Structure formats: C-alpha cells, structure tokens
Design a protein around this nucleic acid. Structure first.
Ligand SMILES: [Zn+2]
Ligand SMILES: [Zn+2]
Lengths: 833, 60, 114
RNA sequence: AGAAGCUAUU
RNA sequence: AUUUUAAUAGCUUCU
C-alpha cells in the first residue's frame, strides 16, 4: 500500500507518503485500544488528503467521503464540487466527518491516561489510529515505574489542528449534555467570561498538551505565547453564543448624568480584556474624553432600534435610522470626440486584435450590502501552531533590515488632510479639523491612553467609482480618525523605512520609471541556478484572510518596539488593532453589523500587512514541500540534513534554533527569490529543485491556500514562465518586454491596450469631457502607453500614436511641441535621471 | 458594430438616469441588468435587441 | 473657533443620544450583572422598543412575518407598518403570491414590542 | 538643483 | 455620503 505516514528516524523525517510492503507485554499493559478489524484508511490518510489537496488526484478523499455517507458518488459528477466559493455546500459535506473526528480525540485522551497509569513512554502518531479512533500499534514503547508514564503528543495534535476547524469537530459541545439529538444549550444573555468553560474544554480534549494555556491572553509572556493561546481560543470560541462577544459596557456618571460607555472587550482570540483607566464618576469633559466617547459604538447601539436583516448572514446589532438606505452606481460618461477620432483614424475595425473590454458598470440599490455579504467566505480557522511559530521566525528574518519604533505628534507625516474621518466625525468635518483642533500634547495623551485601554471604533462602507472588465461594484472600508492617528504614531516610522528601501524582497515604494522595472527584474533574478518564473494572485484577499494570520502580521510589524514599549503596552496596542480593524462594528447604509474578520482596506498598514501575509504563505508552501518528500529519495546530503533539522525544529524543539533559522533563510534566498508587493508576487526559482521537490511549486501554494486560506486557486489566475528574456507574464497589471535601448537591452513595462483605450474613452464626470483643460490626463495616459510603440503588433503600437495626434488636436484647439514628440516620453524610461 | 452598440447603450443609460428613472427601483434594476448584459455580450444580434428594449424604455 | 464648534457638536450628540435611551429597562438589565458589566450586543435585544425587518423575497416573509404579530428573540412583536424598497406603504393584505411581482422587494417591516 | 501648495494619472 | 499606501506629470509661490 502507498499510504500517509508521520516519521522521525535517525535518517529520515517528515509527514509524507510511503510504501508498506516485548510488544506482547506492552499490549498486556495497554476501550481506546484495538483488539479486531481496522478501517482501510487511518487518521493520517485523512489528514494528508485534506492538507495536500490536489484536484484530479483526490481518489483517497473521495473514497473516505463516500464510505462514511458524507455525500453520494454523484456529488462528484458535478464540476467544481470541491470549490469553497463556487460550491459552499462542500462545507456542510465536510462537517459530516466532524463528530467522528471528535470521537477520535476523546479516545486519544483515554489512551494517554492508560499510559500514565502503566509507566509507558512513547510518541503518538496519526497513522496508528484508525478512523474509528482505535489505537493499534505500540512499537517503540518502553517501560517505566507505573503512575509515571509520559506521552509525547505535539506532532499528533499539531498536525490535526486544521482539520478540527475544517470539519467543525466541536459542534456537539454546543448541545445539552453534549449530544447532537439533544437541544441546544440556552446560555444566559449576560454571561461573557467563559474562562472556566475554556479550561474545561482544554482539559477534556488537550489534557496532554505540555505547554501552558492562558484563557485570557492579557496574561501571556511574549508574542509567541500570544499566538499559541490565541490559536486555542480561536478553536474554543466557536461553541459560545455570538452575542457574548465584542465590547463590554457599563454605566458611568458625568455631572450626575448616567452615560453608557465601553469598559472592556471580549475577543474570540484574545479572551477578556479590561480597561485600566476607568473613573466611575467624572466631573467635566475636555476635548480628549469627548472624542473617545463619541467614537465609542456603545451608546450608538444602545440608543438604536433592534434590527433583523435577512439579506445578510452577518450578525446585526442595530439600525440608527428609521429607514434603510440604498446607494446605487451610475454609468460612466462617454467621450464622443475621442470615439470619433479613433473611428476616423481607422480603429475599431471588426476583427481588430484591440477590443474595448473595460467599462463602467451600473448597480441597483442593493449593491453595498451585496458586496458586504462577501465576508461569508471568512471562516474560523485553526492553524498548525508549531508550523506557525517556525514560519513566523523565518518571516521576521525578512524584516531585519528596517528601522522602526514610536514617534511623536510632531514627527507625523500625513499626505491628505481633506480625506474623511468616518462615523460619527464625518458629520462635523474632514480630517483637517481634527488634526488642527488637537494640540501635540492631546495627541500624545491619546496615544498614552491607547497604550492602556481599548477604544472600539465604527468603520463605514463606501462605494468606489472605478473602471473594470468585470461586473462588480467595489466597496472600500473607511476607518475612524482616532484609530488612524494612533496607528500612524505607532507604525509610520517602520512604514516609511520600508517605502524608502531599494533592492529588497518588498518592492513597495519603488518606481517603475527611469529603469526601475529593469532594476527590479534584475534584482529578483539574483543568481538562481536554473531560473523559472512563477506568479499568482489571491482570489479574495481581505474577505478570506484567517484572523490568526492577521494577528501574526500585526505582531511581526510591532516587533520593532523592543526598546520603547513594555509587553503590557504592546499587548494593549495589539488589542486596539484587533478591536478596531479586525472584528468591529461596520456601518453599512444606516445600520450596524458585526465584521466576521479578514481585513479593512482603509487601514493604515494594509499593503504592508498583505506583504507579510504573502511571505508567510510562500514560506509555508516551501516548508510543506520540503517536509513531505521521501528522504531516502533525496540525493544531496545538505538538503537531507536541512529536512531533518527542519522537522526537529518544528515538532521536537520548543526553543528557537537561531542558527537553523539563518540557514533556512539563506536556502530560501538562494533557491526561491521573491519580489512582493501587497498580495502580488513574482518568484524566480530553481527548476531542478522544484522538479525534485526541494522547493515549492504552484501546486504546493494551491494546497496551502486550500487548507489555510479557505479558498481554491484556479490555474486561470496562476502563471509560469520558462524563458527569462520574456519577463513576468503579469505583475501589477503590467506586461514585460525586452526592448533595445541604445546599445543595451532593457526590460520595459507596457499595459493592456484595451485598458488605456477605455480610460481615454470613458470617464466618471461630465466636465472631464467638457473642460478641454485636461491635456495632462492624456499626457499621463500617453506616458503609460508609450512602451506599446515597441510591440511587434502594429495595432498595439498605434495607440500611442493616436494619443499623440489627439493631444495635437487639443493643443491646436487651445493654441508644447514636446507633447507630440516621442523624445519627451522616451526620456521617461531611460536610466539616467 | 459591437463597440457602437456598447457605446450607445452607455449613452442611453446615462440619458435614462437624467430622466430620473433611478428613483424607480424595478425600472432602474431592469435597465442595469440590460446594460450590463449588453456590455458583457459578444454577439451583436441580441445586443441590438437589448438596445431596442432600452430605447423603448427611454421613449416610455 | 472650530475646536469650540466641534466640542459643542460632540456634547450635543452625546446628550441627544442620551435623551432617547429607555433607562428603566437598561437599569433592570445592568443591575443583574455580576459587576455591572454587560455585553453591548444584548442591549438592543432586551431593551429596544422598535424592530426593523428586511425581507428579500416571499419565502422569507412567510417564514418570518406571517400575520400581524410574530415571536422573535423571546418576545412578541405587533406589526406596525410595511414599506417597499421604493419607500411606499404596502398594505398587509397585498402580500400574497399573485401580487408578489407588483411589489418592489425587499420589504421593510416596522414592529413594536408588546 | 531644491522645498511647500493645487490638480491629474496609473 | 466618497478609505490606505506608492510612484509620476503639469501649474503656482519661494531661498
Ligand atoms: Zn499565553
Ligand atoms: Zn513603541
């Protein structure tokens, strides 16, 4: 048989697929133990199938599903049955395994108890447990004094972690007497603590976890302890009422008037957090406290009506207005003159390789809520925690060249002060008012306040007019001003440092002009032995991002404060971020809803957090590719030792092996070179190693997204390139070509001709067609379209010429020459500046 | 011909919006679906028929 | 002068929000907590005196708001008004199968606690 | 060759 | 009622 095994010998190590072509006294010493019959597939088979999912090869998964009446065979006859987005029903199908999984967990504990009462020491593996929960192999177990046995179960539980949330294993815990036929437990409305239930669940299922668990993460030791305890809390928060989460409120007295304020917060991940700077009776309200109380969602909800919205599956809180709101989107404006000129110049002939794809799409009054109901793809996810710890160390090794820390209110740089401040401030003015009316002392005091308390904020949902080749309204999430000010003071130093560095893995801030594209491509090519190019996109970035990876991103970003913030200060900062941009109240057309998680795009650190997320997923794919290969098959001694030490540092070494972290970082930099911007990535990798399996391919990335990001990756959004002279197929919506400039050869980025043509043809405001003082618009479009003159296809190369003749038309109507000369635009891609 | 149909659909939808049709929910929703299907369509026959329907909506 | 103007704006908004707050039920629900701290989500559930329901289609309506009084969240609600997506009053007797196409969905129901 | 203000484009 | 970050062009003031 060719089955999944979890192995650690002196020679080989890993979770992979292998061929399978004293114990009496041990068995005599040891209801969770088999006699009898043994389910063809073990728990290792299921774990490997769900963790290494590949379409067109999931025969074992199909057999496991149709064996246990999770679905029928005809369920697999329909296409995209395995897709999370196109076929949500698969989730329900997966849940049909849940209870069985849960049963296995309980039996494991029994087994371990037996060992602790017989003085037996041994390492638990998933492949010794049948799908019914029966342990049936005691090979290496030795004897010790009875009553002092010890089981090692870190690999078992760590590998099993994702499947617990994938199959919804703890559903039966939400019923009376933990019985699926029994009714649901009727928790009190006022209960919010749940600490003792968390401890009871931990002792029921994870009794033999060696590490210490903190139900409230405010008691943790560092950021790694925060990650570990937050993972456990993510698993345990799925069995508690959804009304028990969010801000905890209280009644205070200001000048004897009773106000309702927020004094704490109950997180799903971080447990219960209480504000320290609380005064039950207050005298007068200055600017700072008035701001904090007005941004508070507590009173807004407390003074609103009960709301029941059946259009959405998001938890609803209240309706501020008495009538629901409807925001539509209008069609674009048509530039008749440009259309006439293009038609006269011989364009738009039927069959031309250049066709108008990008338009402006109108929407009806139910567009904002229709786009808001995309967080339904955000599912609670439990992560392999040993893998997450090693990967977070490797991922921070990518950020060890930047400068960061805390700045003051006189060191803060804000680009645009005419932007909006969010609810409830949007009612009284722009961000200029709130930056101008606060002195630097007030802002410093507000920062000092956020370092010991939690201020919950409300975001707004806005519809953005845009151009696309897809029929979809787009919503952006605007954040309140207070969150932005303290995030700026907390993060701007590091963000500016990242944006002011050249030749690095993250290329945010690097211009594409004046040879920038050539420099970036040459930096990413590095000196990889057998280079191939790979690229990918994330299907739904902000909607379908697990909350654990967002917390990891925030912790990696905040690690720069080693000398300026104590650990309580850093934890309260992280709690503020989680309560402000992760799971907060969302105002969507006059009503308040609860955000499941993911990402708010109007955040101050969105692109950099996305870059951390990209590096984490890539490193995870590399680890899962290296660890799942037959060690005997590998022919290089260095790579085999690297794999063995990677397994040991993952599941056998609680402390951090810094030297091996450096070694793995060097291996990745040599053989897997990345250029990354937000969720966009281009990789130059060693072909021979990827073919042998020593580095990740695109299928490893697809499997990682399948079991971690809750999305499916279609080949229609992934690209591979073999010839390096042709650059990346796509990167930030640009194609690449190797033109001849002077006596050198240089890479040039060019856009899609349809996009530039549509941008010229369609606008969003009527005056954009009437002012005729928009020559700069066409000049910018021509600066973008200039590289197309080097394309072999003539219809492509003719778009820039058409733009030049239209600019001439406009200038001759108004009336320099440079704007119709090709030298002005040729100088925009020359290295010398 | 296709591009002329799409551009004329854009112009006609803009005119209808100028005619305060956006304040009738069913009319505007039907117009939005018709316009989007025109924009994503490929054959000019049904696109012409949809243009005719939108023009009849405008004249009504 | 703006600082003073936005200070007054915040003060007013706070006190007006206060003036709409049904304080007796809030006192009743707060005084039962272990230390006077309650979750925010349950305050409109157990204190609000008006309910708004948004209904996309007829199946959801007949499974949610059948008649003139319905039970939701362990309370009884008397239907006060029904309005269409165009914000025009819809009579209760019109919400049948035959008149479903004429109505402009989704429907907004306003109910009062009873 | 620089800073600051405004608009536009990707 | 219209968010975050980056790059670029044009116009004005000014050592
Ligand atoms: Zn801890
Ligand atoms: Zn700091």
């Amino acid at each position: 048989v060719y089955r999944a095994f979890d192995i650690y010998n002196d020679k080989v190590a890993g979770f992979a697929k292998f061929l399978k072509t004293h114990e009496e006294t041990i068995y005599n010493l040891l209801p969770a133990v088999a006699k009898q019959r043994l389910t063809k597939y073990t728990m290792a088979d299921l774990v490997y199938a769900l963790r290494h999912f590949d379409e067109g090869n999931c025969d074992t998964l199909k057999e496991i599903l149709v064996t246990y009446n999770c679905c029928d065979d005809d369920y697999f006859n329909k296409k995209d049955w395995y897709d999370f987005v196109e076929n949500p029903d698969i989730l329900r199908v997966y849940a049909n395994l849940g209870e069985r999984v849960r049963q296995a967990l309980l039996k494991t504990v029994q087994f371990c108890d037996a060992m602790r009462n017989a003085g037996i020491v041994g390492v638990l593996t998933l492949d010794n447990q049948d799908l019914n929960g029966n342990w049936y192999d005691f090979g290496d177990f030795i004897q010790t004094t009875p009553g002092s046995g010890v089981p090692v179960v870190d690999s078992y539980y760590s590998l099993l972690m994702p499947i617990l949330t994938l199959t919804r294993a703890l559903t039966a815990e939400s019923h009376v007497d933990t019985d699926l036929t029994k009714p649901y437990i009727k928790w009190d409305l006022l209960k919010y603590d749940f600490t003792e239930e968390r401890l009871k669940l931990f002792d029921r299922y994870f009794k033999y976890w060696d590490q210490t668990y903190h139900p409230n993460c405010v008691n943790c030791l560092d950021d790694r302890c925060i990650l570990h305890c937050a993972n456990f809390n993510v698993l345990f928060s799925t069995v508690f009422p959804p009304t028990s989460f969010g801000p905890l409120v209280r009644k205070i007295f200001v000048d004897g008037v009773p106000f309702v304020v927020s004094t704490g917060y109950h997180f799903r991940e971080l447990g219960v957090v209480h504000n320290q700077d609380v005064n039950l009776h207050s005298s007068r309200l200055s600017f700072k406290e008035l701001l904090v109380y007005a941004a508070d969602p507590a009173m807004h909800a407390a003074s609103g009506n009960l709301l029941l919205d059946k259009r959405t599956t998001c938890f609803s809180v209240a309706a501020l207005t008495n009538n629901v709101a409807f925001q539509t989107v209008k069609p674009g404006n048509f530039n008749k003159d440009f259309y006439d000129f293009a038609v006269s110049k011989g364009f738009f002939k039927e069959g031309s390789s250049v066709e108008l794809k990008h338009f402006f799409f109108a929407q009806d009054g139910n567009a904002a809520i229709s786009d808001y109901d995309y967080y339904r793809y955000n599912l609670p996810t439990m992560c392999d925690i040993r893998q997450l710890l090693f990967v977070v160390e490797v991922v921070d090794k990518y950020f060890d060249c930047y400068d960061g820390g805390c700045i003051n209110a006189n060191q803060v740089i804000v680009n645009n002060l005419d932007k909006s401040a969010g609810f409830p401030f949007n009612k009284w003015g722009k961000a200029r008012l709130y930056y101008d009316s606060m002195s630097y002392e007030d802002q410093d005091a507000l920062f000092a306040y956020t370092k010991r308390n939690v201020i919950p904020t409300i975001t707004q949902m806005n519809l953005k007019y845009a151009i696309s080749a897809k029929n979809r309204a787009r919503t952006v999430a605007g954040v309140s001003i207070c969150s932005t000010m303290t995030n700026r003071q907390f993060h701007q130093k590091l963000l500016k440092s990242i944006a002011a560095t050249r030749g690095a893995t993250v290329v945010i801030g690097t211009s594409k002009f004046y040879g920038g594209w050539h420099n970036m491509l040459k930096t990413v090519y590095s000196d990889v032995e057998n280079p191939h190019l790979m690229g990918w996109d994330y299907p739904k970035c902000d909607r379908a991002m697990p909350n654990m990876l967002r917390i990891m991103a925030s912790l990696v970003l905040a690690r720069k404060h080693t000398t300026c913030c104590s650990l309580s200060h850093r934890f309260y900062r992280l709690a503020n971020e989680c309560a402000q941009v992760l799971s907060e109240m969302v105002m969507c057309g006059g009503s308040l809803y609860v955000k499941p998680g993911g990402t708010s795009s109007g955040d101050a650190t969105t692109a950099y957090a996305n870059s951390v997320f990209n590096i984490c997923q890539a490193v995870t794919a590399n680890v899962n590719a290296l660890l799942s290969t037959d060690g005997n098959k590998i022919a290089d001694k260095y790579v085999r030792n690297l794999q063995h030490r990677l397994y040991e540092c993952l599941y056998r070494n609680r402390d951090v092996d810094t030297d091996f972290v450096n070694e793995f970082y060097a291996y990745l930099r040599k053989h897997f070179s990345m250029m990354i911007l937000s969720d966009d990535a281009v990789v130059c990798f060693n072909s021979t190693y990827a073919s042998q399996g020593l580095v990740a391919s695109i299928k490893n990335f697809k499997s990682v997204l399948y079991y971690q990001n809750n999305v499916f990756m279609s080949e229609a959004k992934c690209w591979t390139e073999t010839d390096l002279t042709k650059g990346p197929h796509e990167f930030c919506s640009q194609h690449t070509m190797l033109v001849k400039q002077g006596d050198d050869y240089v890479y040039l980025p060019y856009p899609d001709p349809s996009r530039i043509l549509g941008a010229g043809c369609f606008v969003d405001d009527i005056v954009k067609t009437d002012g005729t003082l928009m020559i700069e618009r066409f000049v910018s479009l021509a600066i973008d379209a200039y590289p197309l003159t080097k394309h072999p296809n003539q219809e492509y190369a003719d778009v820039f010429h058409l733009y030049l003749q239209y600019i001439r038309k406009l200038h001759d109507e108004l009336t320099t020459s440079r704007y119709w000369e090709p030298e002005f635009y040729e100088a925009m891609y020359t290295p010398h500046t | 011909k296709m591009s002329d149909v799409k551009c004329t659909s854009v112009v006609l939808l803009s005119v209808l919006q100028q005619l305060r049709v956006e304040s009738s929910s069913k009319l505007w929703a039907q117009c939005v679906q018709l316009h989007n299907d025109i924009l994503l369509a490929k054959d000019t026959t049904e696109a012409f028929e949809k243009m005719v329907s939108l023009l009849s909506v405008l004249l009504s | 002068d703006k600082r003073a103007k936005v200070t007054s704006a915040m003060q007013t908004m706070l006190f007006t929000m206060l003036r709409k707050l049904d304080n007796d039920a809030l006192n009743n629900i707060i005084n039962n907590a272990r230390d006077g701290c309650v979750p925010l989500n349950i305050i409109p559930l157990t204190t609000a005196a008006k309910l708004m329901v948004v209904i996309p289609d007829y199946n959801t309506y007949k499974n949610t708001c059948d008649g003139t009084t319905f039970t939701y969240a362990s309370a009884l609600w008397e239907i006060q008004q029904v309005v269409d997506a165009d914000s025009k009053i819809v009579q209760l007797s019109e919400i049948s199968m035959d008149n479903s196409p004429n109505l402009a969905w989704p429907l907004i129901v306003t109910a009062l606690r009873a």
